[PDB]
Amino acid sequence: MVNPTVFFDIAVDGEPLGRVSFELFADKVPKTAENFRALSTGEKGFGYKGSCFHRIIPGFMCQGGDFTRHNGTGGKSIYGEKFEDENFILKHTGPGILSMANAGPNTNGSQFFICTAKTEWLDGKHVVFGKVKEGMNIVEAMERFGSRNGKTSKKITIADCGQLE
Numbered sequence: 252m253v254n255p256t257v258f259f260d261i262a263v264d265g266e267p268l269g270r271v272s273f274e275l276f277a278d279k280v281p282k283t284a285e286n287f288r289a290l291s292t293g294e295k296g297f298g299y300k301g302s303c304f305h306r307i308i309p310g311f312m313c314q315g316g317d318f319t320r321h322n323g324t325g326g327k328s329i330y331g332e333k334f335e336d337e338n339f340i341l342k343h344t345g346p347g348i349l350s351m352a353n354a355g356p357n358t359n360g361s362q363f364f365i366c367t368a369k370t371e372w373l374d375g376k377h378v379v380f381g382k383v384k385e386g387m388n389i390v391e392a393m394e395r396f397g398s399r400n401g402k403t404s405k406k407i408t409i410a411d412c413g414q415l416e
């Protein structure tokens with residue numbers, strides 16, 4: 252089994268920006284990778300297409316995945332509202348890391364963040380499960396629409412997403 256790859260096509264106020272692609276570490280965190288993969292294809296009937304990156308903080312991270320409340324208070328996994336922390340084998344080593352948002356132990360849903368800096372104080376508390384493969388330049392472009400309090404100055408949306416061969 253090769254680790255799956257997913258893409259997001261990013262838009263800024265509805266205008267196309269570019270594609271970010273991710274490797275999902277199914278070899279290390281299969282359950283968590285699977286969740287993100289299936290939310291990216293929409294195959295369960297729900298997922299990331301059309302949702303936004305609601306919180307973006309330059310020099311920190313871009314957060315999204317909340318496709319039920321659009322603001323950081325919602326989202327759901329493919330396993331139920333929330334699922335356990337699978338493991339913490341992988342660390343927040345630098346820009347490009349893909350990690351699950353949470354509000355406490357064992358509260359993973361659909362929300363995730365893309366690191367734009369090393370965030371090592373999250374090791375052992377947020378489950379890392381993939382990394383940007385292509386389009387880190389697109390993530391950098393995204394990040395310029397954030398702000399210190401994480402409110403975005405333009406709407407950053409996942410116009411399309413899915414799995415690459």
Ligand SMILES: NC(=O)c1ccccc1
Pocket residue numbers: 312314351352353354364373
């Ligand atoms: N609490 C969180 O979900 C969180 C999200 C993004 C970065 C750090 C933590």
